[PDB]
């Protein structure tokens, strides 16, 4: 079969837009995909348009080879944008590839290595721990989760004194402790918010009596080497990586021994292709893989399959799709909600964990063409904090 | 004063697209910038109107504030496509910040260290030599350019046996010596593929006895830490840079010793506040510039200022604005020919040298909008060679 | 406009002799400089009269372009006594070259990118923890100020058992936060006074727990690498620098990862030519710059420009104009006071922050050339300290 | 015996200013001493003031003790001014005590290793062949010189192409092998006058097959490890350490592999106090010292002596007394000649060594106070070359 036709769906998911892919064969098969939304998602049309130039008339089983034509044809390293648009694609080319087969995608990934897939719930914030207390039990009740990620910020980091910013989060994970269930899991993600490696550094060994299941992200993504020297006396499982965005990227991270756990994001290195090689080269490092995962449903099917297949997957981010909506940091449990209906069916999580569906090709998930189409675009940024003497610093 | 409006013009630069941008302040002034051609520019305008939104209101005086407020709203680090719309509103701003203190750009950047800024033309093929002597000959007595780069590559480098390949560079090279004049320079730009850093060192070390200029991207960009080993028993000048996007992939690539010359690209790496950034490490590692510039006239003027003010610059790439249309590599001088007429009254070279305009503010020339209006997009893409056995290779 | 004339005030700033430079032009201008009071200061005068050879008739915008040429003709590198003359001719050059575009210096670096400038106090001393709040207490209701720098040493090094001598400053810095407030940054400088790395680790662990701002300059200079040593295992934020000269020996400090924080004088290193390509250095690195600064209101006002435009500025060293006389160390809080008087308008801390003066060019400071002439030369050297057996240790 | 004077004489050393020092003791001895001179010689005179201040009433025997006290009173590492003065007043101090004890100075440094001294005629210049040869006869039949140095230079290094450049000065070189004397020894000293590690690495590779002495100094000094990345793959003896100051700089050096010769200043680096600990650490790594020696016949008589205790040493930088004035580069014989006369009975070569003077305490060489009266300062400095640019290069 050819690739004969390519749609693009400017929906959202939430407070956030989402760009959706789908990507039609001659033979009358649909494969879907998922962008990251980095900001500017009304760029992403015209990028895809550009690409599909490329796939037209092609054979999407030849996945590597269209992925990697894709890569070479911009000549510099694609980045954020780009490679946000050719991971739709290359989740679409999977998608197509195991329909054609008539087989689950993880059956083109080397099979499923194991049964369902860990989830932790996405919380984002540092509620007071009887509240925080009671939304995780919520969602244990729920959804069967034990694991969870939080913000360890109490305060305005650049408003207070560093070493009352470290005691308070310090402080507020033993109140955890003391709190919620002793089996539950709590990670806290730092979000690149850390300029030197050595507070990064004073942070991790305050939390690290509590048992973090890990540390994500403390410092900025641009000098890689530095988080060698940040791990050196680090007391604390460290994860990053959600920031990199290709296999060399990360090679280097291993080689300085910067992470402990990485978490690359499957719509943001370019699909399956890039995170097949990523997750390989940290196996051989013995570092395992946590994929970073906001996105939506569509993205949580991805990550389904390419957790089914790979060894050293651990544990993947999730966002319910009836729920909560964008929040980084604060003292509340986020009170906005919203719906995402793109997918009809999406994978719900049961006793914390995400079942396979093997009896269904492809992702094993249906599209709802009209509620992408009833729900459009809307606008999303960051926001970038500043210090009390008019600086900005990172968000 | 403040940014009170950005018009972007979809225009073109012979058959390459090209956006131009201007930001309007409430004082009546305009300052101007050029995006780099990746290639879906068409991304651009949705790029730069999200981007806007975080410049509207605010003192274009505040050039580096302004720049990294861009750079940190995404988080990630921006890629090439975030990266080049980055680029034209950092000229933009450095020519507002000019034209408000009336003077020429390069007195906000520490001031002239040099009178004049030497350039070398941009030839790009591999012409026979009484050819090459021919055009150098015509581009020296029009322009008094004395430095030239080509292509080293006589063959189709996948269809032929190394050695052969090889040969032909070198026997290709020592024809030029026999034929051209002896004080002429002549790089050679090897595109970026060379998948293997032996081969790499064995091309230069053939070239090596012919004094190249410098030796140009032999290697892909990915894995920087080949390019130390690549380097070590070369005996030729090596220069990269031109795909690489920050202060840090600039730094890891000094670090290893993988290049003796870097060639940043102002309108790829986020303008001059990031070009500024790069070119002081490299001067503090003996490194010096070479400005990659395939780009437009208003490109060209923004690197003159960069050029004139940064002690370790060395040499300048320069296209006419009337002349050779996009070409790499191949057998002959290229045909195509077009005029880029959205600058006015571009620098044009003297003894092979860009001359200052100390007189003019800003960047010292004025823009075309009639011109710009008239010709718009124009849709281009690279070719991806392949190898006999029918994979894709590198462009 | 060209440099027409040099006017040099040999002055002094309370107890320590300053020199004080002015550069005119023809077109009826004058930019000022401080140089640092390495000690010898009737050496300075003659350094600067074979300096300004070279300026004479020059045009002063040409910053860079003079500064390095300043550099170059002494063709090895130049020390303390000329890089303190050099310093205060590269200041002469920025605000000449301000005044004459009309802008604050901090135009001509790329723009504020901060509001206002935080500085912390040097108090300098070891005094008991009730008097130093008393001091701290009546310095914030004065200023503002929230943050301020001590000697850790309580008793003389070498006059008793290593264990008790950290132990007392382990014990002091404890009374401290029993005592003061407990938002107030306390810093520690321990004066070069350290042979051992493995000594200054010990202070330094020992005085983690209670948050250091920072542990700046426990052993000598000289040595580069073992400050790499040293920094392996520290606990707190260490920093250095304040007794290296340029670009190339903080490049080496910044890769044997041998300073969280570093602490160029602007006095020192050859001015903001020099101090901005160490602080770019330093950005890449992900280590922050708080400037070394014991010297009086011009070179003040110097680093309030500079700091202001560099993004990776954290706290600036302060003096009050009218204030504490010379000291280092004691358990007294220093009895003798000063005027210093060569500033007219001198920046005062406001909430602990020095403020920009938007509406006026150059530094924002007019000089007293009155006061000046009222006041020469005063003599001053350091006590060089003693151990028991007779020998001399380190100032 | 106690110091009780010190006497300081501005005198000069044909075309260069020079700064002689004399300290007397109570019991009416008096030691000699010279300044290196790097530019701005009026400095000198208050520095050596404000340095007295430390040796007044002081046991001059006690020559460490003294010389590490005038280091550390400074705190900051004393540069280029600060240096050379010390040094002279070390000189003092070994003649001082040398004379106290009745021996000449060799016998307080470990006693004389050799029995003379081998001299390299310093003519700086790069006259042609014949010319070259009948000069080095001239020498050899008056002074015994076997030895000599020259300028690699044939043509202005930024006017022409650098291939050009380097064939030139490899032809030279052959020329020279071709027409002079089959036993001579010819060294090069390329003047830190090239930027790139690699550029200096293709000239000395060029010169190698001819069998120079040794390449001295090729890049500038500040940053030490890209010495290291010079030296691999380099075919012939590197030499360089003139414009390096303490033991620390040359360690640094030496642990990169930076040098296989090492050319430390006895009038630079503080005397024979760090002189001694300077050639102890490349006595430990195997590398020889071939003083640095431009100055004047107390310079060279200092050198005499400290040379004569050093294993390592290998070959002294000598200018005689009356002959050729300033001079580096150029294509003739320099026509300028001049007398210095303020020592009575200078060391003059005999076969092309320097003889010792056993019989004599002290240097074993007499000053002349009047000579030294009747000549006073004379200007000098550098001149830095342009590139046809208008930027500077290096001097
Ligand atoms: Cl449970
Ligand atoms: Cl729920
Ligand atoms: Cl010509
Ligand atoms: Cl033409
Ligand atoms: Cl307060
Ligand atoms: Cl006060
Ligand atoms: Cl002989
Ligand atoms: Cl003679």
Same sequence: chains 1, 2, 3, 4.
Wanted: charged share 25%.
């Amino acid at each position: 079969m050819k690739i004969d036709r390519m749609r693009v769906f400017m929906t959202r998911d939430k407070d956030r837009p989402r760009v959706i892919v789908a990507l039609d064969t001659d033979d009358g098969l649909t494969g879907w995909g998922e962008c990251y939304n980095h900001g500017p998602d009304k760029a992403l049309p015209p990028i895809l348009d550009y690409l599909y130039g490329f796939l037209s008339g092609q054979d999407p089983t030849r996945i590597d080879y269209l992925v990697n034509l894709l890569i070479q044809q911009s000549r510099f390293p694609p980045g954020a944008l780009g490679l946000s648009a050719i991971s739709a694609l290359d989740h679409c080319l999977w998608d197509l590839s195991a329909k054609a087969a008539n087989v689950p995608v993880y059956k083109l990934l080397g099979g499923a290595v194991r049964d369902r897939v860990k989830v932790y719930a996405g919380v984002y914030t540092a509620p007071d721990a009887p509240a925080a207390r009671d939304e995780f039990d919520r969602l244990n009740a729920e959804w069967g989760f034990t694991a969870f990620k939080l913000s360890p910020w109490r305060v305005d980091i650049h408003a207070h004194r560093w070493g009352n910013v470290v005691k308070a989060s310090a402080d507020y994970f033993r109140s955890l402790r003391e709190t919620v269930r002793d089996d539950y899991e709590i990670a806290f993600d730092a979000h690149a918010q850390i300029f030197e490696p050595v507070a990064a550094r004073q942070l991790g060994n305050a939390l690290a009596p509590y048992d973090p299941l890990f540390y994500e992200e403390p410092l900025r993504p641009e000098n890689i080497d530095m988080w060698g020297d940040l791990k050196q006396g680090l007391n604390c499982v460290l994860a990053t990586g959600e920031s990199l965005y290709n296999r060399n990227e990360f090679l280097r991270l291993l080689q300085v021994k910067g992470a402990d756990l990485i978490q690359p994001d499957i719509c943001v290195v370019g699909g399956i292709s890039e995170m097949r090689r990523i997750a390989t080269l940290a196996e051989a490092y013995f570092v395992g893989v946590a994929p970073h995962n906001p996105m939506g449903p569509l993205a949580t099917a991805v990550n389904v399959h390419f957790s089914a297949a790979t060894q050293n997957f651990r544990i993947l981010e999730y966002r319910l799709p009836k729920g909560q909506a964008y929040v980084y940091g604060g003292k509340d449990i986020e009170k906005r909600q919203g719906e995402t209906r793109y997918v009809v069916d999406p994978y719900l999580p049961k006793d914390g964990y995400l079942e396979l569906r093997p009896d269904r090709p492809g992702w094993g998930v249906e599209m709802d063409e009209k509620a992408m189409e009833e729900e459009g675009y809307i606008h999303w940024q960051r926001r970038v904090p500043k210090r009390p003497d008019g600086s900005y610093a990172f968000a």
